[PDB]
Design a protein around this ligand. Structure first.
Ligand SMILES: *[C@@H]1O[C@H](CO)[C@@H](O)[C@H](O)[C@H]1NC(C)=O
Lengths: 120, 50
């Protein structure tokens, strides 16, 4: 029931960026976790998703080499690292969970969405 | 078709390299049950009527 987004893209210069969500309403090793984003004008698009227990991970065609969807089975937390920040990554991000293997427009639990944006 | 008069064709005896889906990057609710998306490529059964 609890899946909250925090952090931001409040960057005065380019660099490594982190997002720190927490899953503290239900289990986190059963509900396959996910991470989506809605650009300011562009729709909710897939960013990353994880398996049930974190055993399988894959990304999109433009975020795979510069992202890190890190989950935490213990201590109830989850992070998304964004590396080599680019202007094509302006969005509001959501941590998510579902009974499948993430990757669903409608999840089991939906994040609030923190604004991450890269400006150079 | 729809959910009230859906058809069930035979899905076997034909090449199915489901990696042809994994470069899609346009789906919304790709989910897989009894199998992960990855491990339905190395092993995948017959009688897989779609
Ligand atoms: C269907 O179209 C999408 C995008 O146009 C593509 O990613 C997918 O591979 C296509 N599938 C088949 C079976 O043609």
């Amino acid at each position: 029931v609890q899946l909250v987004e925090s952090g931001g893209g409040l960057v005065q210069a380019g660099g490594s960026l982190r997002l720190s969500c927490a899953a503290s309403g239900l289990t986190f090793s059963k509900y396959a976790m996910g991470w989506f984003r809605q650009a300011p004008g562009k729709e909710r698009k897939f960013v990353a998703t994880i398996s049930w227990s974190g055993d399988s991970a894959f990304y999109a065609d433009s975020v795979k080499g510069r992202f890190t969807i890190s989950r935490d089975n213990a201590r109830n937390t989850v992070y998304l690292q964004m590396n080599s920040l680019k202007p094509e990554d302006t969005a509001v991000y959501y941590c998510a969970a579902d009974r499948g293997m993430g990757y669903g427009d409608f999840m089991d639990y939906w994040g609030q969405g923190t604004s991450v944006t890269a400006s150079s | 078709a729809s959910v009230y008069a859906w058809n069930r064709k035979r899905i076997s005896n034909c090449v199915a390299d489901y990696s042809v889906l994994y470069n899609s990057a346009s789906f919304s609710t790709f989910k897989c049950y009894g199998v992960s998306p990855t491990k339905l490529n190395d092993l995948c059964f017959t009688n897989v009527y779609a």
